[PDB]
Amino acid sequence: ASRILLNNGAKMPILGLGTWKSPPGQVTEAVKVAIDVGYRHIDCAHVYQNENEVGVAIQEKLREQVVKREELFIVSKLWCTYHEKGLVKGACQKTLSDLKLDYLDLYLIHWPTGFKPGKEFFPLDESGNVVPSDTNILDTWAAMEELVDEGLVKAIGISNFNHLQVEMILNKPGLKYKPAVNQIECHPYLTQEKLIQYCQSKGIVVTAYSPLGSPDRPWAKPEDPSLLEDPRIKAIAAKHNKTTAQVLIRFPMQRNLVVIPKSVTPERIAENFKVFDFELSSQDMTTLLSYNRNWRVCAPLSCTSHKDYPFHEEF
Ligand SMILES: NC(=O)c1ccc[n+]([C@@H]2O[C@H](COP(=O)([O-])OP(=O)(O)OC[C@H]3O[C@@H](n4cnc5c(N)ncnc54)[C@H](OP(=O)(O)O)[C@@H]3O)[C@@H](O)[C@H]2O)c1
Ligand SMILES: O=C(O)Cn1ccc(=O)n(Cc2nc3cc(Cl)ccc3s2)c1=O
């Protein structure tokens, strides 16, 4: 089916539109087209610096009577410089104002690491190390819970949390809301079998990001693995008369994951949603899982000393 049930009773579309690196000059058109061809879930973040333009597109399609707010599933994320409990609500409200919404369907702690509060999103010292903040995940979570109680957001969750960071929250004394979602990197070179098993066994829905391997990521090296150009995956697609991207989007869907491929190119936006008319076989699934190399798009060395850096742990 097209939607998956969350712990709060709401249903989440399993295919959404990513917006990281979608320039402000193009993401309004991307979103409009996306809604026109069927997308109802949009993945956003304050750090992507384009939530206003995303908001422009939603507002207009609401105005046009193309969609109703209730049919939309809008996700955003609390950036790292706002982990202090006194900053959380303001950060949420800024996102809501920018998107021109009165609630979010889902709001995530973007990363488990808090960074020094201030205007810079990535504060570094004179030697380039990220400057942390003295916040911890449990106090940040409690501040996220308050947003649910105040009606700003319908569900809360986490992103880039390892299973021990997830358990810290689950085991929180006085926990009010369990996380609904853990949004993590996931694709054939980073298949996340252990963390997915963990999360799904705890009734936490997993959303896969960079499912196409983020070729537009700014730190890409020419020699890095390229999913979209992998000849083995090209062959699986050719057999189904689909593109490599469609194969890469359909793969996590068949794992009971949500997936959020990014594009600002109208034809690719449309292409990427045409993944409900075919099935990957059991062999296809097995083959794609066998490509795991434990290889991350997102894992910058500049964060690796943070006390809460998530990827020292096996999962
Ligand atoms: N939670 C977090 O920490 C986190 C981290 C990373 C990403 N995410 C979210 O996950 C989303 C997806 O990940 P991502 O943006 O890193 O990368 P991605 O979705 O893996 O790949 C996007 C890249 O693929 C290209 N593309 C899209 N459809 C294509 C197609 N059919 N054929 C060929 N190329 C295609 C896009 O090009 P064009 O756009 O130029 O068409 C863009 O360069 C993000 O936008 C963001 O919403 C969350
Ligand atoms: O966060 C997003 O959704 C998109 N994005 C944008 C810029 C960027 O550098 N990254 C890489 C990061 N790695 C860590 C790793 C850790 Cl531990 C904390 C923060 C980050 S940000 C990134 O993923």
Swiss-Prot record:
Highly expressed in embryonic epithelial cells (EUE) in response to osmotic stress. Changing residue 48 to F: Complete loss of glyceraldehyde oxidoreductase activity. The modification N-acetylalanine is found at residue 1. Substrate binds at residue 110. The active site is at 48 (proton donor). GO terms for molecular function: aldose reductase (NADPH) activity; all-trans-retinol dehydrogenase (NADP+) activity; allyl-alcohol dehydrogenase activity; electron transfer activity; glyceraldehyde oxidoreductase activity; glycerol dehydrogenase (NADP+) activity; L-glucuronate reductase activity; prostaglandin H2 endoperoxidase reductase activity. It is found in: Cytoplasm. Its main location: cytoplasm. The record marks 77 as: Lowers pKa of active site Tyr. Keywords: Acetylation, Cytoplasm, Lipid metabolism, NADP, Oxidoreductase, Phosphoprotein. It catalyses: an alditol + NADP(+) = an aldose + NADPH + H(+); all-trans-retinol + NADP(+) = all-trans-retinal + NADPH + H(+); 9-cis-retinol + NADP(+) = 9-cis-retinal + NADPH + H(+); 13-cis-retinol + NADP(+) = 13-cis-retinal + NADPH + H(+). Belongs to the aldo/keto reductase family. This is Aldo-keto reductase family 1 member B1.
